[PDB]
Amino acid sequence: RAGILQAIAEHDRIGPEAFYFLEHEGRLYDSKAIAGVAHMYKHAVAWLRREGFTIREAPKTFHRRVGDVRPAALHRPVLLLWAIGQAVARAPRLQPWSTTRDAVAPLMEKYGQVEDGVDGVRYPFWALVRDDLWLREDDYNLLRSQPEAAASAAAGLIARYFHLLPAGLLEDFGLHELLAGRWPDALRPLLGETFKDRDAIWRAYGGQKMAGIGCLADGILSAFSDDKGPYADGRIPDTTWIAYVGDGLSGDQKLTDGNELMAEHQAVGRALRYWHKPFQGQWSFETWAVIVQRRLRWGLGEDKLPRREFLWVLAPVPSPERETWPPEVLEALEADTGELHDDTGDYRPSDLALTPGAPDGTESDDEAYRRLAQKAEANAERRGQLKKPTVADKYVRDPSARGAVLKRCQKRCENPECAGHPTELTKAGLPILQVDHVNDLAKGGPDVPWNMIALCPNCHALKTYGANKVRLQRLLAATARRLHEEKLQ
Amino acid sequence: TRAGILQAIAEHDRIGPEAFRATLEHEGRLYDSKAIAGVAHMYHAVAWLRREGFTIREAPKTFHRRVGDVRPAMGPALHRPVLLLWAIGQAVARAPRLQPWSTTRDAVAPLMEKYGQVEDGVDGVRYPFWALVRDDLWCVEQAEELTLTSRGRRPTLESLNAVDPSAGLREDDYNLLRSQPEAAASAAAGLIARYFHLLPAGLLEDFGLHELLAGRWPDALRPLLGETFKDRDAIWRAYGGQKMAGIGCLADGILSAFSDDKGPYADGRIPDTTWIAYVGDGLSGDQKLTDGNELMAEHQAVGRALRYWHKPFQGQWSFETWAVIVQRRLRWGLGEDKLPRREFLWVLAPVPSPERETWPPEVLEALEADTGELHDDTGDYRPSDLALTPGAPGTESDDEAYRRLAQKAEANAERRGQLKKPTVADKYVRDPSARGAVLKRCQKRCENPECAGHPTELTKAGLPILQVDHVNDLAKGGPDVPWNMIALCPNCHALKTYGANKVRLQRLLAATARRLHEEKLQ
Ligand SMILES: [Zn+2]
Ligand SMILES: [Zn+2]
């Protein structure tokens, strides 16, 4: 297929009209089109590179380039934001150094927290040229023609750098009449946009397919949750908050890549996009959310081996704007402290259900247990003396107590009136049971084994919406305490 | 007194409200009624001013609300919003608040012809030029001089061209728009949402709203997706409307449907999909296309979206999605008087925004196929047959006149099977008649012959702790008929869906479903 040299020669002889780019002898040629004409002489790019040709990328969209403006740093975005405000107000494209300086230098002092604003303008006045933003022709015309793009770009810059939006930002800059009601309204995707593949998302907004946690073309963080099986979404029960597992595939996860970015977002209290694919369903950007707590937990990697993993507790919010965030969220930060809450202690990989064992090492009896129940009590007492308890403190479930109930019940219903239940396991190899509190956490009940009970689907239904739910609750409360106390002597 | 009062009003204008406080609706400007009466005299009182022919007012509802009250009474009620939209465009571009009829006429009349689908645009402007006054949005200066139509609500063309009266927006409204662009963008978006939802190229300019709304028009609309409220009252405080299930319209005049989950084992969402099955309006007897249902039908015809509120069980309300009416059906259900009744089933498809460009192809295809006509499923089944009607039964029917139900299920199933382009509604909405049949067959018991055991206790709502479920999933082409369905307890259902021996069980259930079905035919 090197005969494409003949196709290139005809592109030269007749012109672009008649004939991702392909570079040959200092000239650019449409990759797909050259491949097609060569055929007569979607895996095209590979074919051309397999022949000895260097393939170059198309010029990055204005949205992408303004999105690439990231810290290694408020200088660049301040200038950019001024430039957008200028273009929207029909100011001239090119302006002299002299006016830009003493027009932006006050902004640079007040919003870019730099001392010498005059000097502050010098850096981005030059550095922004090698960011392919310094405005350009096509960019200036884009902003003058399509105000959505101006509003989007400014919203992107405002989201990442000035998420707290201090009063007098929109004017002082040129942007008050443009951003108006709400600044992040111009951001895309819209809440509820649906995509089949992860690739489809990528095509539309960029970033990469790799990783749960990553930034889209706009430079705003995005976290992706894929439901593995049915009866298992990220949502922590009795609430609308998410328990999002962290970034590292296969071994003990670290504050690198996605987890790192999450931590950077946690510290400053910046929101992020939360994507979600229900089981047998499509992806969708379903909510903005804010890091409210981070913890460490035992889980399994892709190598099926136990591992330390991060648990990012996310709180959904209507938009990035902090004024729009409900008070439960705003209370959960500041209470956060931004520090890792660790797992081990009360919590051995089994302990909990996803690691089968005999137990082959007879070190621990199944009736320890007692170790789990103790940790559950300790943790419970410590939560019980929280003056202002966040919804996370209240509803996130202690692994140790769940573990204890599992060790106690041994794949059976603990309801002594059980009509009967199957001993078949699930596809994933767990019993068809659920551990549930007799006295709901929502109504003050404690997160401890003697307040919990293992139930088959049928008995669980009885407990939850059965006609005699109340009497059953009494019975279950009794038998839970009983079963608990039987394992202490 | 009347001309005395006019002279008093004229001096209030000359000097200003501050200097009047230093020393009643007329202009489109409000005047302190006691104070105006007093200056009229010596240079209640209320009775005197109303005696002389002046409209005496309370503090008008918010501009948002009043523009939202602009509602219709192939159908021509685009006059008022066309004028209003022009006026907002004018105010944003710093034009004068009051403008002569002459200019407004031949500035708006082309807009009226192009966007208001009226023939004579020049004549089209007359109606809202006057009618908008009594909507508390407009004012016309020397009104008394005009001669009205025989009918009431149009000044005649001759009288308008003669006097050339300076008319416009109200005072405070004009200042609101001139000061706060969010309010302009909101009002315009409202009008564009209800009229012109299919936003044609390019009305934003022509109207002088391009710079304000070009990016996306509905961005200025509130509430935002995901706003959460405790009560229905909390919603009402923030956005108006009434505490009616709805449709109800909020203050902005945009339709809003509210779904409140009754117990824990249901939401509106039709299974296997994200589309909603929303029960109509009208609390108690056979529902009619009146109130909310009427509005839903108007929205269905033109393919206009609407706000869908939802409160999960033991949870809070939230505006969770925009949605579009994709199909409407008639079904048997129970009213608030606990009695069987004919009710509407509005099949909603969620969408990201009101803009049609943003809607996915499944939605577009389903709308394309709709026909907008009522599908009456009420003939296929009886209120007996629904699980919420407790009964002996008969003597109309033995319980093995289940045969009746199964027959209707077949007939419907065959008719769906021959659909060339089947919408996701056609495929996934579940036939009551077949469900009913399974319920009459199983009689409050698990049909899985290997059932480990299940309780005979009922739910709080008085239904057995079971579920009817297809052995061959509809999603995988299985038919919506009783011999393809099976009644399972929670345990057996879990076994079916994610048990380790799911596959073998499916074969067993398929077999026993056919068997049980065929036992009732002989
Ligand atoms: Zn049980
Ligand atoms: Zn069963």
Q: Alpha helix locations (H) across B218-288?
A: 232-239
Q: How many CB atoms lie within 10 A of CB A299?
A: 18
Q: Which residues pair with B139 in a beta bridge?
A: B168
Give one word for B453, left, alpha or beta, with left for phi > 0 and alpha for psi -120 to 50.
left
| A167, burial (CB in 10 Å: exposed 0-12, middle 13-18, buried 19+) | exposed
Nearest residue to A47 via CA among A65, A33, A27, A66: A33
Cis peptide before B395 (omega within 30 of 0): yes
Q: Which residues pair with B317 in a beta bridge?
A: B229
Give backbone dihedrals phi and psi of A279, rounded to 5 degrees, phi first. -55, 125
Nearest residue to A354 via CA among A390, A296, A410, A305: A305
Resolution in A: 3.2
Measure B441 CA to ligand 2 centroid, in angstroms.
15
A323 and chain B: CB distance < 8 Å anywhere? no
Q: Which residue of B lies nearest to A470 if distances are taken between CA atoms?
A: B460
Strand-pair category, A221-226 with A242-245? unpaired
Half-sphere exposure of B161 (CA within 13 A, CB side): 6
**Residue A288 near residue A318, CB atoms below 8 Å:** yes
Interchain contact, A466 vs B460, CB within 8 Å = yes
What is the C-alpha to C-alpha distance for residues B428 and B445, in angstroms, rounded to an integer?
A: 25
3-state secondary structure of B405: helix
**Helices B2-15 + B33-41 axis angle, to 10:** 110
Q: B98-130 burial, b if ≥16 CB within 10 A, otherwise e? A: bbebeebbeebbebbbebbebeebbebbbbbbb
- List Cβ neighbours of B371 (8 Å cut-off, separation of 6 or more): none
Query: Which residues from B are below 8 Å from A230, CB to CB?
Result: 497-498
Half-sphere exposure of A24 (CA within 13 A, CB side): 19
**If you search the block for the tokens 């039908």, which residue do you land on?**
B297
CA B74 to chain centre: 20
**Residue B517 near residue B483, CB atoms below 8 Å:** yes
Measure A422 CA to ligand 1 centroid, in angstroms.
9
At B137, list the tokens.
């949005």
Give just the sign of the alpha carbon dihedral B404, B408, B410, B411. positive
Query: Which residues from A are below 8 Å from B353, CB to CB?
Result: 190
Strand-pair category, A271-277 with A221-226? parallel
Nearest residue to B138 via CA among B104, B179, B186, B93: B104
DSSP letter for A169, please: S
Instruction: Give the type of residue at A446.
Output: P
A126 and chain B: CB distance < 8 Å anywhere? no
**Residue B284 near residue B335, CB atoms below 8 Å:** yes
Query: Which site among A421, A463, A464, A473 would you substitute to test the B interface, given the most B Cβ atoms closer than 10 Å to its Cβ?
Result: A421
- List Cβ neighbours of A126 (8 Å cut-off, separation of 6 or more): none
What is the C-alpha to C-alpha distance for residues B463 and B323, in angstroms, rounded to an integer?
A: 31
Query: Degrees (nearest 5) of the Cα angle A225, A231, A234?
Result: 30
Q: Which residues pair with A214 in a beta bridge?
A: A222
What is the C-alpha to C-alpha distance for residues B458 and B464, in angstroms, rounded to an integer?
A: 5
At B84, list the tokens.
């209003």
Q: Which residues pair with A235 in a beta bridge?
A: A242
User: Which of A148, A191, A281 shows the shortest C-beta gap to B215?
Assistant: A148
At B502, list the tokens.
């799911």
Give backbone dihedrals phi and psi of A123, rounded to 5 degrees, phi first. -60, -60
**Helices A370-384 + A399-409 axis angle, to 10:** 150
Measure B485 CA to ligand 2 centroid, in angstroms.
14
What is the C-alpha to C-alpha distance for residues B325 and B370, in angstroms, rounded to an integer?
A: 9
What is the C-alpha to C-alpha distance for residues B420 and B438, in angstroms, rounded to an integer?
A: 28
**Residue B340 near residue B383, CB atoms below 8 Å:** yes
Interchain contact, A465 vs B264, CB within 8 Å = yes
**Residue B513 near residue B450, CB atoms below 8 Å:** no
Interchain contact, B491 vs A456, CB within 8 Å = yes
- List Cβ neighbours of B35 (8 Å cut-off, separation of 6 or more): B20
**Residue A320 near residue A288, CB atoms below 8 Å:** yes
Interchain contact, B495 vs A432, CB within 8 Å = yes
What is the C-alpha to C-alpha distance for residues A126 and A4, in angstroms, rounded to an integer?
A: 41
**Residue B297 near residue B248, CB atoms below 8 Å:** no
DSSP letter for A105, please: H
Q: How many residues does the structure list for chain B?
A: 522
At B295, list the tokens.
């509005």
Give backbone dihedrals phi and psi of B241, rounded to 5 degrees, phi first. 85, -155
3-state secondary structure of B350: strand
Q: Which residues pair with A285 in a beta bridge?
A: A275
Give just the sign of the alpha carbon dihedral A93, A99, A105, A110. negative
At A38, list the tokens.
């060569």
**Residue B307 near residue B240, CB atoms below 8 Å:** no
Cβ under 8 Å to A: B residues 458-477: 458-462, 465, 475
Nearest residue to B88 via CA among B224, B190, B199, B202: B190
**Residue B291 near residue B280, CB atoms below 8 Å:** no
A232 and chain B: CB distance < 8 Å anywhere? no
Nearest residue to B275 via CA among B227, B313, B308: B308
What is the C-alpha to C-alpha distance for residues B310 and B394, in angstroms, rounded to an integer?
A: 39
3-state secondary structure of A54: strand
**Residue B115 near residue B179, CB atoms below 8 Å:** no
What is the C-alpha to C-alpha distance for residues B440 and B437, in angstroms, rounded to an integer?
A: 5
**Cα separation values, B175 from A389, B188, B217, B300, Å:** 47, 16, 22, 37
Give backbone dihedrals phi and psi of A22, rounded to 5 degrees, phi first. -120, 125
Which residues in chain A are followed by a discontinuity, with C-to-N distance exceeding 2.5 angstroms?
Answer: 19, 41, 72, 134
What is the C-alpha to C-alpha distance for residues B206 and B208, in angstroms, rounded to an integer?
A: 6
What is the C-alpha to C-alpha distance for residues A134 and A124, in angstroms, rounded to an integer?
A: 9
Nearest residue to A382 via CA among A349, A341, A347, A348: A341
Query: Which residues from B are below 8 Å from A149, CB to CB?
Result: 215
**Residue B29 near residue B57, CB atoms below 8 Å:** no
- The sheet with strand A54-56 has its strands ordered as A27-30, A21-24, A54-56
Give backbone dihedrals phi and psi of B289, rounded to 5 degrees, phi first. -75, 65
Give just the sign of the alpha carbon dihedral A102, A104, A106, A108. negative
Instruction: Give the type of residue at B307.
Output: R
Cβ under 8 Å to A: B residues 59-88: none
Residue A2: enclosing H or E segment and its boundaries? Answer: none
At A355, list the tokens.
């690691």
Strand-pair category, B305-311 with B255-260? parallel
Q: Which residues pair with A7 in a beta bridge?
A: none
**Residue A359 near residue A413, CB atoms below 8 Å:** no
Q: How many CB atoms lie within 10 A of CB B419?
A: 11
Strand-pair category, A283-300 with A221-226? unpaired
Cα Rg for chain B, rounded, in angstroms? 30
What is the C-alpha to C-alpha distance for residues B347 and B345, in angstroms, rounded to an integer?
A: 6
Calculate the dihedral angle through the C-alpha atoms of B16, B21, B22, B26, rounding to the nearest 10 degrees.
30
Query: Degrees (nearest 5) of the Cα angle A426, A432, A438?
Result: 150
Give backbone dihedrals phi and psi of A458, rounded to 5 degrees, phi first. -70, -50
At A194, list the tokens.
């649906």
**If you search the block for the tokens 């320890």, which residue do you land on?**
A368
Interchain contact, B457 vs A466, CB within 8 Å = yes
Nearest residue to A14 via CA among A29, A3, A36, A31: A29
What is the C-alpha to C-alpha distance for residues B470 and B485, in angstroms, rounded to an integer?
A: 4
**Residue A383 near residue A375, CB atoms below 8 Å:** no
Helix (H) and strand (E) counts in chain B: 21, 13
Q: Alpha helix locations (H) across B96-194?
A: 101-115, 121-124, 126-131, 157-163, 171-179, 181-194
